XYZ file of C-alpha atoms in Angstrom:
283
model
C 113.078 56.971 152.053
C 112.587 57.531 155.782
C 110.463 55.249 157.956
C 109.513 57.014 161.186
C 106.781 56.671 163.806
C 104.972 58.566 166.552
C 102.737 57.452 169.409
C 99.339 59.108 169.778
C 96.574 58.683 172.328
C 95.020 57.599 174.469
C 91.663 59.273 173.842
C 87.933 58.557 173.992
C 85.384 58.347 171.199
C 81.882 59.529 172.073
C 78.906 57.833 170.387
C 79.591 55.114 170.647
C 81.723 54.984 173.802
C 85.211 53.754 172.919
C 88.588 53.843 174.645
C 91.372 54.187 172.094
C 94.732 53.179 173.623
C 98.107 54.748 172.889
C 99.113 53.302 169.524
C 102.136 53.753 167.272
C 101.543 55.405 163.910
C 104.328 54.634 161.452
C 104.747 56.741 158.327
C 106.900 56.974 155.210
C 108.520 60.323 154.446
C 110.259 61.716 151.361
C 112.007 65.013 150.672
C 113.177 67.961 152.757
C 111.795 67.948 156.338
C 111.875 71.762 156.440
C 109.871 72.204 153.227
C 106.661 74.157 153.848
C 105.117 72.571 150.758
C 103.667 69.304 152.022
C 101.799 66.459 150.352
C 100.122 63.944 152.640
C 99.141 60.634 151.082
C 96.461 58.367 152.539
C 96.235 54.754 151.376
C 93.220 52.580 150.611
C 91.320 50.269 152.964
C 93.717 47.313 153.028
C 96.654 49.211 151.526
C 99.587 51.040 153.113
C 101.883 54.061 152.798
C 104.284 52.378 150.366
C 101.613 52.593 147.659
C 102.764 56.188 147.193
C 106.514 55.522 147.172
C 107.055 55.910 143.425
C 105.071 59.135 143.038
C 106.755 60.474 146.184
C 110.242 59.783 144.820
C 109.336 61.941 141.823
C 107.709 64.755 143.813
C 110.075 64.940 146.802
C 112.245 67.457 144.945
C 109.497 70.094 145.163
C 107.424 68.741 148.046
C 107.779 67.198 151.464
C 105.772 63.989 151.217
C 104.401 62.174 154.240
C 102.473 58.932 153.820
C 100.632 57.821 156.949
C 100.125 54.159 157.804
C 96.736 54.081 159.518
C 96.242 51.637 162.440
C 96.384 47.962 161.486
C 98.306 48.614 158.271
C 101.976 47.858 157.546
C 104.262 48.964 160.383
C 101.461 50.677 162.298
C 100.316 49.028 165.528
C 97.084 47.019 165.499
C 93.997 48.104 167.417
C 92.939 45.509 169.989
C 89.221 45.898 169.271
C 88.092 45.655 165.614
C 85.361 48.246 166.208
C 88.062 50.818 166.957
C 88.818 50.707 163.234
C 86.530 53.565 162.223
C 86.527 57.031 160.670
C 86.283 58.777 164.042
C 89.559 57.165 165.105
C 91.164 57.913 161.731
C 90.113 61.578 161.765
C 91.409 62.162 165.296
C 94.620 60.270 164.510
C 95.182 62.385 161.394
C 94.598 65.670 163.225
C 96.812 64.539 166.114
C 99.418 63.567 163.519
C 99.339 67.043 161.950
C 100.011 68.907 165.195
C 102.791 66.513 166.213
C 104.756 66.906 162.977
C 103.769 70.567 162.555
C 101.869 69.988 159.303
C 99.902 72.974 157.983
C 97.934 73.499 154.752
C 99.160 70.412 152.905
C 97.941 68.836 149.683
C 95.831 65.764 150.412
C 96.155 62.717 148.176
C 93.763 59.941 149.142
C 92.901 56.583 147.614
C 89.626 54.855 148.529
C 89.314 55.090 152.317
C 92.091 57.682 152.349
C 90.117 59.838 149.942
C 87.032 59.613 152.140
C 89.082 60.664 155.175
C 90.317 63.690 153.241
C 86.792 64.479 152.071
C 85.402 64.478 155.612
C 88.327 66.499 156.974
C 87.971 69.092 154.214
C 84.199 69.206 154.709
C 84.615 69.786 158.431
C 87.445 72.301 158.248
C 87.256 74.567 155.208
C 90.875 75.686 154.856
C 92.720 72.617 156.146
C 93.983 71.588 152.696
C 95.875 73.507 150.027
C 94.400 71.040 147.529
C 92.496 67.738 147.501
C 93.150 64.812 145.160
C 90.676 61.919 145.158
C 91.911 58.672 143.608
C 88.767 57.009 142.218
C 86.485 57.929 145.108
C 83.543 60.322 145.119
C 80.381 61.531 146.817
C 78.511 58.273 146.231
C 79.190 54.532 146.114
C 76.853 51.764 144.969
C 76.528 48.948 147.510
C 76.798 46.122 144.960
C 80.428 46.688 143.943
C 81.297 47.495 147.562
C 80.029 44.085 148.664
C 82.094 42.347 145.977
C 85.349 44.003 147.069
C 84.662 43.217 150.722
C 84.165 39.505 150.085
C 87.539 39.213 148.357
C 89.264 40.780 151.363
C 87.087 38.839 153.813
C 88.686 35.556 152.774
C 92.041 35.309 154.548
C 94.786 33.802 152.403
C 98.227 32.275 152.989
C 100.898 32.506 150.286
C 103.897 30.261 149.599
C 106.372 32.729 148.092
C 106.683 36.217 146.598
C 105.909 34.764 143.166
C 102.556 33.348 144.264
C 101.976 36.506 146.303
C 102.381 38.719 143.235
C 99.985 36.543 141.235
C 97.485 36.997 144.063
C 97.890 40.773 143.840
C 97.445 40.684 140.059
C 94.036 39.101 140.671
C 92.626 41.203 143.517
C 94.187 44.405 142.176
C 93.506 43.595 138.520
C 91.851 46.984 138.001
C 94.696 49.200 139.222
C 96.314 49.108 135.790
C 100.018 48.734 136.570
C 101.912 48.569 133.271
C 105.409 47.625 134.458
C 106.411 44.358 136.138
C 109.009 46.245 138.186
C 106.120 48.078 139.843
C 104.278 44.824 140.535
C 107.431 43.605 142.274
C 107.736 46.788 144.334
C 104.056 46.640 145.289
C 104.314 42.993 146.348
C 107.421 43.719 148.433
C 105.497 46.076 150.724
C 102.068 44.438 150.461
C 102.907 41.078 152.021
C 105.089 39.944 154.921
C 106.649 36.622 155.935
C 105.202 34.727 158.901
C 106.447 31.866 161.066
C 106.082 28.743 158.926
C 107.126 30.149 155.550
C 103.891 31.571 154.276
C 103.098 35.138 153.302
C 100.106 37.143 154.406
C 98.843 40.592 153.489
C 100.611 43.165 155.651
C 97.507 44.425 157.447
C 95.311 43.476 160.406
C 92.493 41.233 159.065
C 90.272 42.683 161.814
C 89.894 45.745 159.575
C 87.398 43.787 157.461
C 85.251 43.543 160.601
C 75.631 46.554 153.176
C 73.684 49.663 152.166
C 74.601 52.372 149.658
C 77.145 55.015 150.667
C 76.172 58.688 150.515
C 78.763 61.417 151.075
C 76.885 64.287 149.429
C 76.619 66.404 152.587
C 80.386 66.039 152.930
C 81.193 66.659 149.262
C 79.151 69.876 149.148
C 81.035 71.459 152.053
C 84.521 71.026 150.577
C 85.917 74.466 149.746
C 89.406 73.820 148.360
C 90.991 72.899 145.024
C 89.897 69.414 143.958
C 91.297 66.870 141.516
C 89.248 63.743 140.867
C 91.130 60.854 139.277
C 88.723 58.406 137.654
C 89.326 54.893 136.372
C 86.987 54.410 133.426
C 86.171 50.771 134.220
C 85.571 51.584 137.891
C 82.345 50.550 139.609
C 83.169 52.395 142.834
C 83.209 55.759 141.059
C 80.847 56.100 138.102
C 80.201 58.719 135.417
C 76.733 59.414 136.824
C 78.158 60.088 140.286
C 80.711 62.436 138.728
C 78.028 64.279 136.752
C 75.970 64.792 139.912
C 79.076 65.902 141.817
C 79.666 68.751 139.360
C 76.246 70.225 140.146
C 77.154 70.850 143.787
C 80.914 71.446 143.587
C 83.693 72.292 141.119
C 86.698 70.095 140.336
C 89.156 69.018 137.651
C 88.760 65.504 136.254
C 91.587 63.123 135.352
C 90.210 60.143 133.431
C 92.251 56.959 133.036
C 91.012 54.522 130.387
C 93.030 51.422 131.290
C 92.317 51.403 135.029
C 89.408 50.665 137.347
C 89.293 51.056 141.121
C 91.726 52.356 141.794
C 94.642 53.719 139.712
C 97.983 52.613 141.165
C 99.728 55.976 140.735
C 102.775 53.905 139.789
C 102.621 54.629 136.066
C 104.781 57.592 135.013
C 101.807 58.556 132.854
C 99.711 59.080 135.993
C 102.568 60.461 138.098
C 103.524 63.161 135.586
C 99.938 64.354 135.120
C 99.482 64.853 138.866
C 102.811 66.684 139.038
C 101.558 68.846 136.170
C 98.200 69.559 137.813
C 99.992 70.628 140.993
C 102.110 73.100 139.012
C 99.077 74.980 137.667
C 98.596 76.666 141.030
C 101.540 77.399 143.330
């Protein structure tokens, strides 16, 4: 497991006017650096690159796997202004990242926010991805479950030890469906970090948390690559109705997971081996 980093920027976002400073993007890499077969993994909203460590350790024999820590997450530098945390910044950062590390035609694996980033990128640039895997995220999201998730993250929490930290993760990530305790331990290890005073906090900038339904249909329709949609059956972020409507405008394979909600951890061998299988269909 390699932990590297590059500095990108500065640049300017138009509409609205923003100045994005030079910031350090850390990333976690597995496998052979010279491998032309690349999988890029993009974490969820408050998550980080280490969410893909287990699946990467399994796939790094056939693929080069790069997991990007987006600004304000894990070992990636924070953005000074909370409004800089947006999809325009993320898109530019991702594209800048690609050129810097010479990444071409990779497979995109995105959870939550990471999936949306991949969706937009693939919708904007037709042949940017060899394949696209969406981890419980689709062309539409109801506002009601989105508000619920936001309010959990909105409350900032301090934690005594790793034991109380894990029990916190088992509550806020109760839907991810991790089956092994060893994987709960690994997740906790890279989800929280010690602070001065002996407490533990979530290893991300709380400014990231700073209403209406979400429609990504125009984006979903323009995607022109191979798509795998992983769906947690008890998920409220991605529903069966959304999936049914998605099929009318685009074609994709569907991986349904009964025991998980939003979103599957990709830490169960069950889930890992299926994805590895799906990737082997094409080559």
